[PDB]
Design a binder for these strands. Structure first.
Ligand SMILES: Nc1ncnc2c1ncn2[C@H]1C[C@H](O)[C@@H](COP(=O)(O)OP(=O)(O)OP(=O)(O)O)O1
Ligand SMILES: [Ca+2]
Ligand SMILES: [Ca+2]
Length: 319
DNA sequence: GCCG
DNA sequence: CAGTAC
DNA sequence: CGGCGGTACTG
């Protein structure tokens, strides 16, 4: 729909970003839920009382909204730390978070060139710094498709029955993507095994995979790769790529989880908890007693159904 | 930051 | 264990 | 006042 409260959310996003890079994770989360609540509200917010009735907006958030309504400006925006642009600069390095960004700032570093010459870097952060510009830009939707087809083609060379899906914002119909996550499975329930490691080998040989961030991550029977790819041809940029191989049993939940968004996932976890359940990339389960009971879910719709929730197409999962 |  | 990412 | 998910890898 249309955001009737753009004059409000524009300013709040600045604060959310400031709180974010300063390590204040929960405070940032509150702003994010608030901003989401505002831009999905059916009309302009016009009073403190009306603001408070909205779930996700309490007194402190309502005070700010009202200030914006009354004067058109937020005072807090004029008192945000001078360090925020620099901490944001450092936080856009893959492998570096707020703790690192603060350490670097406290060491006197103020630019990427300083990090490069005076700072110690993990192998991951060195790759993040090397591809900094390319990772900051979002790719055209059409490029996410080619990357998907590249992984798909290499995978079906081992087993034609394999199924590959690109999740994330791409699956949600965004015109651009921050990165690509390709989910791979097989319907026979077994042929997905033994594919992952020699798939990555193949993709390295043809020069598609350029760097590894996490070469291998084993979570249950899921296998995950985090790395960097680059399509053939002149002018092509380095892009963030994820490859997850999952068994068919967990495909619906994995699909649901990697499609996102992260806000949406969080909301579904909360909803699951109210019905005495848990939701992960692997399954929908009854709450812990020993472990819990895995409720089987062949399709994403079965997940919504077991949660007593009307299905939402991927395009409608922004939060 | 907000909620239960 | 702490930090980071998913 | 505590939860806002739980898990894996890197160092
Ligand atoms: N704290 C979390 N932060 C980010 N992603 C998470 C988190 N928890 C679960 N996920 C999931 C949801 C995401 O859809 C999935 C990977 O998607 P991701 O690349 O991070 O963003 P996105 O593809 O939805 O948007 P975009 O491409 O614009 O960055 O990881
Ligand atoms: Ca409220
Ligand atoms: Ca993505």
């Amino acid at each position: 729909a249309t955001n009737h409260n753009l004059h409000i959310t524009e300013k709040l996003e600045v604060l959310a970003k400031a709180y974010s890079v300063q390590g204040d994770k929960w405070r940032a989360l509150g702003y994010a839920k608030a901003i989401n609540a505002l831009k999905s509200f059916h009309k302009p917010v016009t009073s403190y009382q009306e603001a408070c009735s909205i779930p996700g907006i309490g007194k402190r958030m309502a005070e700010k909204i009202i200030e914006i309504l009354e004067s058109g400006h937020l005072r807090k925006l004029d008192h945000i730390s001078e360090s925020v642009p620099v901490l944001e600069l450092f936080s856009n390095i893959w492998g570096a978070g707020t703790k690192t960004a603060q350490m670097w700032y406290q060491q006197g570093f103020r630019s990427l060139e300083d990090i490069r010459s005076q700072a110690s870097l993990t192998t991951q952060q060195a790759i993040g710094l090397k591809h900094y510009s390319d990772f900051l830009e979002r790719m055209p939707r059409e490029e996410a498709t080619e990357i998907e087809q590249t992984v798909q083609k290499a995978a079906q060379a081992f087993n034609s029955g394999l199924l590959c899906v690109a999740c994330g914002s791409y699956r949600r119909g965004k015109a651009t993507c921050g990165d690509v996550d390709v989910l791979i499975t097989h319907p026979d329930g077994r042929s997905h095994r033994g594919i992952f490691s020699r798939l990555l080998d193949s993709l390295r040989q043809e020069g598609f995979l350029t760097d590894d961030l996490v070469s291998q991550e084993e979570n249950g029977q899921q296998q995950k790769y985090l790395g960097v790819c680059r399509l053939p041809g002149p002018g092509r940029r380095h892009r963030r790529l994820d490859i997850i191989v999952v068994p068919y049993s967990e495909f619906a939940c994995a699909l649901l989880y990697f499609t996102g968004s992260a806000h949406f996932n969080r909301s579904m976890r909360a909803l699951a908890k109210t019905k005495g359940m848990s939701l992960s990339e692997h399954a929908l389960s009854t709450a812990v007693v020993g472990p819990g009971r895995v409720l089987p879910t062949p399709t994403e719709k079965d997940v919504f159904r077991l949660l007593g929730l009307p299905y939402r197409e991927p395009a409608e999962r922004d939060w």
